[PDB]
Amino acid sequence: PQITLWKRPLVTIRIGGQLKEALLDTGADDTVIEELNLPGCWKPKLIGGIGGFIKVRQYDQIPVEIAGHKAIGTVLVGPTPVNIIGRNLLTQIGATLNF
Ligand SMILES: CCCC[C@@H](CN[C@@H](CCCC)C(=O)N[C@@H](CCC(N)=O)C(=O)N[C@@H](CCCNC(N)=[NH2+])C(N)=O)NC(=O)[C@@H](NC(=O)[C@@H](NC(C)=O)[C@@H](C)O)[C@@H](C)CC
Numbered sequence: 553p554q555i556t557l558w559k560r561p562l563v564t565i566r567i568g569g570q571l572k573e574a575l576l577d578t579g580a581d582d583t584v585i586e587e588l589n590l591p592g593c594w595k596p597k598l599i600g601g602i603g604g605f606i607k608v609r610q611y612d613q614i615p616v617e618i619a620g621h622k623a624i625g626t627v628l629v630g631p632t633p634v635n636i637i638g639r640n641l642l643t644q645i646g647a648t649l650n651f
Pocket residue numbers: 577579580581582583584598599600601602632633634636638
């Protein structure tokens with residue numbers, strides 16, 4: 553699709569069999585989702601944002617369906633204020649910015 557930016561670019565994703573809402577975030581290197589269980593092994597990581605750093609769980613090679621487009625890649629899980637789809641998965645679905 554073509555998504556304009558008058559409103560937050562929120563979309564439905566499927567991850568681990570569950571439906572969630574997430575923000576398409578060109579300013580995020582990585583995909584960060586609120587605390588939940590995912591299958592498999594994770595390792596501890598820290599990530600930064602506007603306000604500082606938080607601790608997250610890094611899961612690799614997780615399938616995510618993003619507005620009906622498939623991706624498989626890293627998902628970080630932790631106390632993010634908003635679920636965000638970052639460039640690691642936006643590139644997989646062919647997302648670009650256009651103006
Ligand atoms: C979680 C809240 C929504 C997404 C977030 C994405 N902003 C980018 C900004 C770039 C850094 C300052 C971000 O956090 N990116 C992180 C996301 C985490 C991630 N791992 O991908 C990032 O790329 N982090 C990199 C580091 C890049 C930082 N800069 C740098 N390396 N020079 C990293 N790998 O840790 N937006 C925001 O932080 C903005 N917040 C908002 O829009 C709203 N606030 C809330 C709480 O939703 C609004 C109500 O204010 C800020 C800028 C104020 C207008």
